[PDB]
Design a protein around this motif. Sequence first.
Motif, PDB file in Angstrom:
ATOM      1  N   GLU A 126       5.970  19.382  -8.651  1.00  0.00           N
ATOM      2  CA  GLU A 126       7.007  19.037  -9.600  1.00  0.00           C
ATOM      3  C   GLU A 126       8.337  19.711  -9.154  1.00  0.00           C
ATOM      4  O   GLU A 126       8.343  20.891  -9.048  1.00  0.00           O
ATOM      5  CB  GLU A 126       6.628  19.543 -11.046  1.00  0.00           C
ATOM      6  CG  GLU A 126       5.218  18.794 -11.595  1.00  0.00           C
ATOM      7  CD  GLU A 126       4.918  19.639 -12.824  1.00  0.00           C
ATOM      8  OE1 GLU A 126       5.104  20.528 -13.165  1.00  0.00           O
ATOM      9  OE2 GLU A 126       4.033  18.909 -13.582  1.00  0.00           O
ATOM     10  N   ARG A 158      -0.589  12.236 -25.931  1.00  0.00           N
ATOM     11  CA  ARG A 158      -2.039  12.208 -25.687  1.00  0.00           C
ATOM     12  C   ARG A 158      -2.756  12.340 -26.831  1.00  0.00           C
ATOM     13  O   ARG A 158      -3.010  13.324 -27.612  1.00  0.00           O
ATOM     14  CB  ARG A 158      -2.208  13.535 -24.649  1.00  0.00           C
ATOM     15  CG  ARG A 158      -1.226  13.919 -23.668  1.00  0.00           C
ATOM     16  CD  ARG A 158      -1.438  15.133 -22.655  1.00  0.00           C
ATOM     17  NE  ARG A 158      -0.547  15.000 -21.472  1.00  0.00           N
ATOM     18  CZ  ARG A 158      -0.829  15.990 -20.524  1.00  0.00           C
ATOM     19  NH1 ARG A 158      -1.735  16.661 -20.673  1.00  0.00           N
ATOM     20  NH2 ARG A 158      -0.153  15.805 -19.519  1.00  0.00           N
ATOM     21  N   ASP A 178       3.558  11.772 -17.517  1.00  0.00           N
ATOM     22  CA  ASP A 178       4.375  12.673 -16.732  1.00  0.00           C
ATOM     23  C   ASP A 178       5.915  12.069 -16.852  1.00  0.00           C
ATOM     24  O   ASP A 178       6.240  11.640 -15.560  1.00  0.00           O
ATOM     25  CB  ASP A 178       3.991  13.025 -15.232  1.00  0.00           C
ATOM     26  CG  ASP A 178       2.911  14.272 -15.599  1.00  0.00           C
ATOM     27  OD1 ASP A 178       2.530  14.503 -16.579  1.00  0.00           O
ATOM     28  OD2 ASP A 178       2.672  14.869 -14.291  1.00  0.00           O
ATOM     29  N   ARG A 213       2.793  16.243 -24.699  1.00  0.00           N
ATOM     30  CA  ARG A 213       3.383  17.134 -23.759  1.00  0.00           C
ATOM     31  C   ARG A 213       4.283  16.574 -22.757  1.00  0.00           C
ATOM     32  O   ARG A 213       4.881  15.414 -22.812  1.00  0.00           O
ATOM     33  CB  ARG A 213       1.979  17.646 -22.723  1.00  0.00           C
ATOM     34  CG  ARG A 213       1.208  18.588 -23.540  1.00  0.00           C
ATOM     35  CD  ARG A 213       0.297  19.641 -22.507  1.00  0.00           C
ATOM     36  NE  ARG A 213       1.289  20.386 -21.508  1.00  0.00           N
ATOM     37  CZ  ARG A 213       0.975  20.454 -20.420  1.00  0.00           C
ATOM     38  NH1 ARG A 213       0.054  20.304 -19.537  1.00  0.00           N
ATOM     39  NH2 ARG A 213       1.981  21.178 -19.501  1.00  0.00           N
ATOM     40  N   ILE A 214       4.737  17.406 -21.807  1.00  0.00           N
ATOM     41  CA  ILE A 214       5.717  17.052 -20.828  1.00  0.00           C
ATOM     42  C   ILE A 214       6.771  16.271 -21.309  1.00  0.00           C
ATOM     43  O   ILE A 214       7.224  14.947 -21.327  1.00  0.00           O
ATOM     44  CB  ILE A 214       5.014  15.959 -20.010  1.00  0.00           C
ATOM     45  CG1 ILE A 214       3.322  16.235 -19.816  1.00  0.00           C
ATOM     46  CG2 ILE A 214       5.450  15.880 -18.443  1.00  0.00           C
ATOM     47  CD1 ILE A 214       3.176  17.595 -19.301  1.00  0.00           C
ATOM     48  N   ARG A 246       8.586  23.556  -7.922  1.00  0.00           N
ATOM     49  CA  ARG A 246       7.253  24.125  -8.316  1.00  0.00           C
ATOM     50  C   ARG A 246       6.201  24.343  -6.765  1.00  0.00           C
ATOM     51  O   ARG A 246       6.110  23.083  -6.065  1.00  0.00           O
ATOM     52  CB  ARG A 246       6.143  23.326  -9.339  1.00  0.00           C
ATOM     53  CG  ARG A 246       4.908  23.763  -9.522  1.00  0.00           C
ATOM     54  CD  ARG A 246       4.306  23.088 -10.721  1.00  0.00           C
ATOM     55  NE  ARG A 246       2.866  23.268 -10.988  1.00  0.00           N
ATOM     56  CZ  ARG A 246       2.406  22.973 -12.059  1.00  0.00           C
ATOM     57  NH1 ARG A 246       2.888  22.545 -13.159  1.00  0.00           N
ATOM     58  NH2 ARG A 246       1.084  23.127 -12.113  1.00  0.00           N
ATOM     59  N   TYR A 282       6.453  23.572 -20.304  1.00  0.00           N
ATOM     60  CA  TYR A 282       7.420  22.853 -19.507  1.00  0.00           C
ATOM     61  C   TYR A 282       8.584  22.331 -20.592  1.00  0.00           C
ATOM     62  O   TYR A 282       8.462  23.078 -21.570  1.00  0.00           O
ATOM     63  CB  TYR A 282       6.571  21.191 -19.330  1.00  0.00           C
ATOM     64  CG  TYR A 282       5.809  21.164 -18.499  1.00  0.00           C
ATOM     65  CD1 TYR A 282       5.692  19.965 -17.837  1.00  0.00           C
ATOM     66  CD2 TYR A 282       5.064  22.186 -18.067  1.00  0.00           C
ATOM     67  CE1 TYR A 282       4.877  19.741 -16.676  1.00  0.00           C
ATOM     68  CE2 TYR A 282       3.947  22.099 -16.914  1.00  0.00           C
ATOM     69  CZ  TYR A 282       3.870  20.715 -16.322  1.00  0.00           C
ATOM     70  OH  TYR A 282       3.039  20.461 -15.246  1.00  0.00           O
ATOM     71  N   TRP A 295      -4.969  13.553 -10.793  1.00  0.00           N
ATOM     72  CA  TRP A 295      -4.938  14.355  -9.619  1.00  0.00           C
ATOM     73  C   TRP A 295      -5.873  14.147  -8.428  1.00  0.00           C
ATOM     74  O   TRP A 295      -5.390  14.155  -7.364  1.00  0.00           O
ATOM     75  CB  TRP A 295      -4.581  15.788 -10.127  1.00  0.00           C
ATOM     76  CG  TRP A 295      -3.978  16.443  -8.737  1.00  0.00           C
ATOM     77  CD1 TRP A 295      -4.257  17.623  -7.977  1.00  0.00           C
ATOM     78  CD2 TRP A 295      -2.406  16.517  -8.739  1.00  0.00           C
ATOM     79  NE1 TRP A 295      -3.335  18.207  -7.530  1.00  0.00           N
ATOM     80  CE2 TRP A 295      -2.142  17.397  -7.490  1.00  0.00           C
ATOM     81  CE3 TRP A 295      -1.358  15.808  -9.006  1.00  0.00           C
ATOM     82  CZ2 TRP A 295      -0.809  17.572  -6.806  1.00  0.00           C
ATOM     83  CZ3 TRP A 295      -0.085  15.989  -8.396  1.00  0.00           C
ATOM     84  CH2 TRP A 295       0.063  17.043  -7.330  1.00  0.00           C
ATOM     85  N   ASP A 348      -4.774  16.293 -19.042  1.00  0.00           N
ATOM     86  CA  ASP A 348      -3.863  15.426 -18.306  1.00  0.00           C
ATOM     87  C   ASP A 348      -4.514  13.996 -18.095  1.00  0.00           C
ATOM     88  O   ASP A 348      -5.623  13.811 -18.174  1.00  0.00           O
ATOM     89  CB  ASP A 348      -3.619  16.092 -17.041  1.00  0.00           C
ATOM     90  CG  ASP A 348      -3.050  17.361 -16.946  1.00  0.00           C
ATOM     91  OD1 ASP A 348      -2.436  17.526 -18.088  1.00  0.00           O
ATOM     92  OD2 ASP A 348      -3.038  18.220 -16.182  1.00  0.00           O
ATOM     93  N   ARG A 371       2.248  31.400 -19.377  1.00  0.00           N
ATOM     94  CA  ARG A 371       3.537  30.412 -19.733  1.00  0.00           C
ATOM     95  C   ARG A 371       4.015  31.254 -21.046  1.00  0.00           C
ATOM     96  O   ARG A 371       3.869  30.499 -22.065  1.00  0.00           O
ATOM     97  CB  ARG A 371       3.011  28.938 -19.778  1.00  0.00           C
ATOM     98  CG  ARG A 371       2.695  28.517 -18.364  1.00  0.00           C
ATOM     99  CD  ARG A 371       2.143  26.940 -18.301  1.00  0.00           C
ATOM    100  NE  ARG A 371       2.003  26.577 -17.020  1.00  0.00           N
ATOM    101  CZ  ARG A 371       1.289  25.362 -16.750  1.00  0.00           C
ATOM    102  NH1 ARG A 371       1.554  24.549 -17.683  1.00  0.00           N
ATOM    103  NH2 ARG A 371       0.958  25.034 -15.446  1.00  0.00           N
TER     104      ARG A 371
HETATM  105  C1  LIG Z   1      -0.764  14.068 -12.777  1.00  0.00           C
HETATM  106  C2  LIG Z   1      -0.925  15.499 -13.491  1.00  0.00           C
HETATM  107  O1  LIG Z   1      -1.828  15.915 -13.191  1.00  0.00           O
HETATM  108  N1  LIG Z   1       0.307  16.068 -13.902  1.00  0.00           N
HETATM  109  C3  LIG Z   1      -0.005  17.589 -14.293  1.00  0.00           C
HETATM  110  C4  LIG Z   1       0.234  18.519 -13.427  1.00  0.00           C
HETATM  111  C5  LIG Z   1      -0.369  18.499 -12.097  1.00  0.00           C
HETATM  112  O2  LIG Z   1      -1.816  18.478 -12.548  1.00  0.00           O
HETATM  113  C6  LIG Z   1      -0.070  19.967 -11.303  1.00  0.00           C
HETATM  114  O3  LIG Z   1       1.375  19.750 -11.276  1.00  0.00           O
HETATM  115  C7  LIG Z   1      -0.718  19.670 -10.151  1.00  0.00           C
HETATM  116  O4  LIG Z   1      -0.737  20.794  -9.528  1.00  0.00           O
HETATM  117  O5  LIG Z   1       0.102  19.784 -13.921  1.00  0.00           O
HETATM  118  C8  LIG Z   1       0.236  20.088 -15.386  1.00  0.00           C
HETATM  119  C9  LIG Z   1       0.401  21.590 -15.835  1.00  0.00           C
HETATM  120  O6  LIG Z   1       0.426  21.613 -17.163  1.00  0.00           O
HETATM  121  O7  LIG Z   1       0.212  22.605 -15.139  1.00  0.00           O
HETATM  122  C10 LIG Z   1       0.803  18.842 -16.353  1.00  0.00           C
HETATM  123  C11 LIG Z   1       1.128  17.724 -15.837  1.00  0.00           C
HETATM  124  O8  LIG Z   1       0.507  16.599 -16.587  1.00  0.00           O
END
Ligand SMILES: CC(=O)N[C@H]1[C@H]([C@H](O)[C@H](O)CO)OC(C(=O)O)=C[C@@H]1O
Lengths: 522, 522
Positions: free
Chosen positions: A377, A201, A250, A182-183, A393, A488, A278, A207, A457
Amino acid sequence: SDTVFVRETQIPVLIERQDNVLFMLRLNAKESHTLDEVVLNFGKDVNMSDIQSVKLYYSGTEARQNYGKNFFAPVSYISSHTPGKTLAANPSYSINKSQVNNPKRKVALKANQKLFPGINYFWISLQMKPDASLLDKVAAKIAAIKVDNKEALMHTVSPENIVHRVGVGVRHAGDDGSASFRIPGLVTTNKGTLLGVYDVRYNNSADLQEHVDIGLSRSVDGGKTWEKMRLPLAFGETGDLPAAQNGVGDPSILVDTKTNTVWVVAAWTHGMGNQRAWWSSYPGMDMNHTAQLVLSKSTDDGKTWSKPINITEQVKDPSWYFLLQGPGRGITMQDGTLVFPIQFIDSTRVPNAGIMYSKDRGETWKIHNYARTNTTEAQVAEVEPGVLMLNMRDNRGGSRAISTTKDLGKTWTEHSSSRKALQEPVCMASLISVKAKDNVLNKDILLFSNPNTVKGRHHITIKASLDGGVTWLPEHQVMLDEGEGWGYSCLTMIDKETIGILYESSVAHMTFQAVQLRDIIK
Amino acid sequence: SDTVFVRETQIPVLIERQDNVLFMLRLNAKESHTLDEVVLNFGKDVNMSDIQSVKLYYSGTEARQNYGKNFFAPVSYISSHTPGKTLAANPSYSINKSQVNNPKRKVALKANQKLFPGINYFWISLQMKPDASLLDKVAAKIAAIKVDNKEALMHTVSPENIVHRVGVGVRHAGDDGSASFRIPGLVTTNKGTLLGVYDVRYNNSADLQEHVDIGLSRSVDGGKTWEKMRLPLAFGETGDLPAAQNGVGDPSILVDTKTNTVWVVAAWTHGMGNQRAWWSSYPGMDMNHTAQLVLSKSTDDGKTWSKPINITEQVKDPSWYFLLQGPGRGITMQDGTLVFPIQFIDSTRVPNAGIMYSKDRGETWKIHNYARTNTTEAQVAEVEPGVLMLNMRDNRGGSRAISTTKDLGKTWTEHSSSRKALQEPVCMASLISVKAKDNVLNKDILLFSNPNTVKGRHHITIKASLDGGVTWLPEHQVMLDEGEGWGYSCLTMIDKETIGILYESSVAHMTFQAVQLRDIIK
Ligand SMILES: CC(=O)N[C@H]1[C@H]([C@H](O)[C@H](O)CO)OC(C(=O)O)=C[C@@H]1O
Ligand SMILES: CC(=O)N[C@H]1[C@H]([C@H](O)[C@H](O)CO)OC(C(=O)O)=C[C@@H]1O
């Protein structure tokens, strides 16, 4: 009388796949008994020597409660999720009724399929030559369907003049022992080398925190072929903890155009059990309390990568819960400044996007102020010299936020396009700037890619702006993938006339496609 | 000062696994810096010759927001779900710190593990010899834990005198190319052969409709080893549809004790797209409208199986949406009548459990009247001559329903134990009767197995009744699996003193265990 309804797909045709869904057919057989054949004509410009086979599959019937919902398949035909089984149609869902290898422009596919007294689903599969060029475009039309030895009525619900584009599944579920990838991040080096980075992953698609490395695929031929996966960043059992409590993810990648040194930045999370970083990264500065900002650099065009360089203490405010890069890519400014988008969850646990920059070729970095509250992001582009445009975002939902800065993040000015021009479902999005000197149109252009929706998505789209991001004309857009996926994407210019995109698609975890700049700006 | 908290597990020790979780340890290291070793003492009656190794794993720390929730692990250590990877500890979650092969009754497991400043998780793994006996019982205690070269304070939260039982993973995720296996049935033939049947759910764990066969595992040595999987019922591309639109599932198996002919009944669903048969089977009688009730029979002790016998026209009311067997097993009554529990969704869309019987060795079958409304899966036992007891999954929630009939289901009487004595989370449950002459207690007994809860499918338990199911005393019970799983189980008598159980467990999709009758009725 019965009618065969036809829906043409708009998804990438992966060159290495054994199957790709080209058309779906639905026939409610109130009177029909047998489907005899389907006749197909490829467009006059299709390079037939790049096509390996065309196949007709039968996929059975539908649940009676779903009659009338206008579905064109009972199930998804080719998995992009099952490890080791994403290259060929699942034979338990689809029966191969006809196959033509090395086809001519006109293809007759004999089915002789007895029809269920009710709904019947068929589909056409396109398989390319392993050798096929990334710029191939495939067009085709169903000319006739024979049922009970008579020409059957047809109706096509999909639009005319669909352009089917090929692509490369750079990473598939299961590849190299990893459940998912991913990412994406993507850059072109000063030597034209393509470098694509991503999360590996291993255990599943969760995540951080988890067993996650940064992987990298390197292409010296414009994305046609990719060298074996490298791991620029991988922490294993560092600091005496299990590997799944040492994920790094990420990624964001940039090329220092002044030296061709390549930089990858990522978030190394240490500890945190098996919960999401997160919500598991906290105030502090060391690896036992908070996510670490790490770099790896390459001075040999992406072939070898340094051990991790920890820069947390340079740029992280101790009061923040979590500082990490904006995934995707960074930039070199005209004046030589290196810039990575970033985002931090502050002491109130609210996330905010901004940028981090280096004026000494990557030795030191600094962050000033965030651009906008409750954003995560983001990607940055030098829209005009000295003017950085940050495209974010936004957790408010529904549209990207956009602001600019001419002092490297001290002060931010909301842009007219902000929260209006670029809809999103709250998801990563890519933004790059291509200067007139560097592209075949001799025009400044912005390129943006994301899921062109407010919910879900899907419909991954590249959009172009000719007025510095004030206007994104529907005319200047290419829809690459109508299917659902993780959403993404990251853009680069392969060369002065060709866009490269690496993205999470409905057909492969990492899908790469080349799109001619003239296709999107005619 | 720090305390190491210990939670001993209560799950089956699979003989073919490379790892089994025996103890979990949690140390919040506010003062401690290093964990040096853990000393284990097996009970005096353990057969050490059947133990291949013990291991000490370190599994890191916990997310800070989860402190104080009394967790003893950050994650599941050994998967029972991931195809091809359910036999060994996931290395990314657990670091092997020490291992002793062919251990002595007292074992020291070194760690020299530097501790995280916070929660620290360890666990002890037990690996049996491959030829270990199914009757093995393993008891152990943690005699000492050394921290910073001193004896650490210990507190055990789990009860004393836990008996760890071994078992056999007859079927694991991924075996023979199938993603999952579900829905156990189990019988013992007149020759002592064990026959276990189940759904082979090739693509994933979804219920019908899908690509599903009935599989069968056969053992001639009391369940220690099992022959290559057989497929008594499989429909592939019958009726010109894909295999995934031809699943057959939810098997029930019985032995005709008068002849030793073995019968398997299952539900063959044809068409229905990729939707659930529960909602996609409709009134009617033929395969294009409604689920078909199919039989296969064996006259060579389960080695080979007849072509399907479609008995739908014999027993299904056309107005029923769905008629199927009750999964698990059926019986032979003393008078020679064969009996399979059944269930049907009637014309008012409500399911009702009942029984189907044959008086002519299975050539023809009959159904009279349902026992209770809004009931589904059930199992039947002849508690005394001519008195059939039906024990039913009840959609009202919380408890099994129980009724009896003396006229093969024409009329029914609610039993005193109904909706009181046997709690359930609404799940399949097994019931058998073992007559006095056929067991070593020389008493008629009933044996029952299910998840002994009102919520969740966990704590799989066998219960015994000495008074025809009027009372189920707490002391006559054995809890085999505290973990979570899909919950289904089926009982049989291996021999005059041994119970066999095949069930969906927390450690293997199909788990077989042998339990001495005297263990449950002391
Ligand atoms: C560190 C982390 O969690 N990165 C995640 C990110 C985040 O959770 C979100 O942007 C917070 O709102 O979102 C997602 C997603 O597919 O939506 C993938 C990323 O890996
Ligand atoms: C034909 C069918 O669907 N059988 C399913 C059964 C049924 O859905 C339910 O009993 C109706 O209420 O339930 C479940 C379950 O794990 O709970 C598995 C069985 O395969």
